[PDB]
Amino acid sequence: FEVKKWNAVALWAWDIVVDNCAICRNHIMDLCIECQANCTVAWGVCNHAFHFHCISRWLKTRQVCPLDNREWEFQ
Amino acid sequence: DVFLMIRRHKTTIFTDAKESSTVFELKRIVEGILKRPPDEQRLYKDDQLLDDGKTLGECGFTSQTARPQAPATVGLAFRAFEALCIEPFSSPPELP
């Protein structure tokens, strides 16, 4: 079989491998909840990129990733 | 997407093909681009004859070996077969 003509829809998104900051549940383009009213993005060794303030508070609480069980580190 | 450097004396042809495909259409396309009868072309891979129905991926070169870089030293000859006298490329000058 073949097709004479086709119609499509496509959801373009930026090519960043990370999607969201899973602390404040805010997209990483915008600012964290601690930071909106007044930031930098901190990556991880386990392909974990979140907000700087959120990561700082989380590591002040515990040295564990918020989704898996692995020791946090900077880049 | 296998790549080949089909050589015959001075003449050299750079050809793209598929991993699993016979040499029949290879001989037909070199016939089309060489403007000569098709039956006299005989491909040599390091100076040995190969089957006319066997796929070229299994012949000794694959897409991992025959890259867009230096593909293969595939020689070609025409029946008058002619002796394989593939002219090598000119030697680079003596650098200081």
Binding site: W14, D15, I16, V17, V18, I28, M29, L31, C39, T40, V41, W43, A49 | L95, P96
Partner: protein
Amino acid sequence: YNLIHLDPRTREGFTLLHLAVNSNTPVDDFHTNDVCSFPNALVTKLLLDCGAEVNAVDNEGNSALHIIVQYNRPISDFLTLHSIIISLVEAGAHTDMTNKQNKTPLDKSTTGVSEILLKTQMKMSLKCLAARAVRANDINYQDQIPRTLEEFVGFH
């Protein structure tokens, strides 16, 4: 345009394009902070439309592309970082040329996001690969090449 065709340079060779690209460019502590943020994609586009030397180098040899890749906030203002690299490459910057330390902007990217954007925007040329091979092997190229190509070996 008139200011660009005087080639204004700071102490460290920064042209008028480099400072609009740089993130360390000082913005005054007064009300200028609210409106003037460097890097700015509109200023870079305006300067390139007005004829800024997109391949100009500073004292360290870093071109306009070498400074935008070193930007340390690739995701917070990715809209800014994307458009300036598009403008720099479309204006005719070399996505391969090296500074005084022989460091390609891919090597001086220090950021995955900028590296991905630049690798997307690179256009491959045999002249660039050959000149990179010449520079890497330290081949004596003086008085063996065109004079216009000596510069090309100089930065590639």
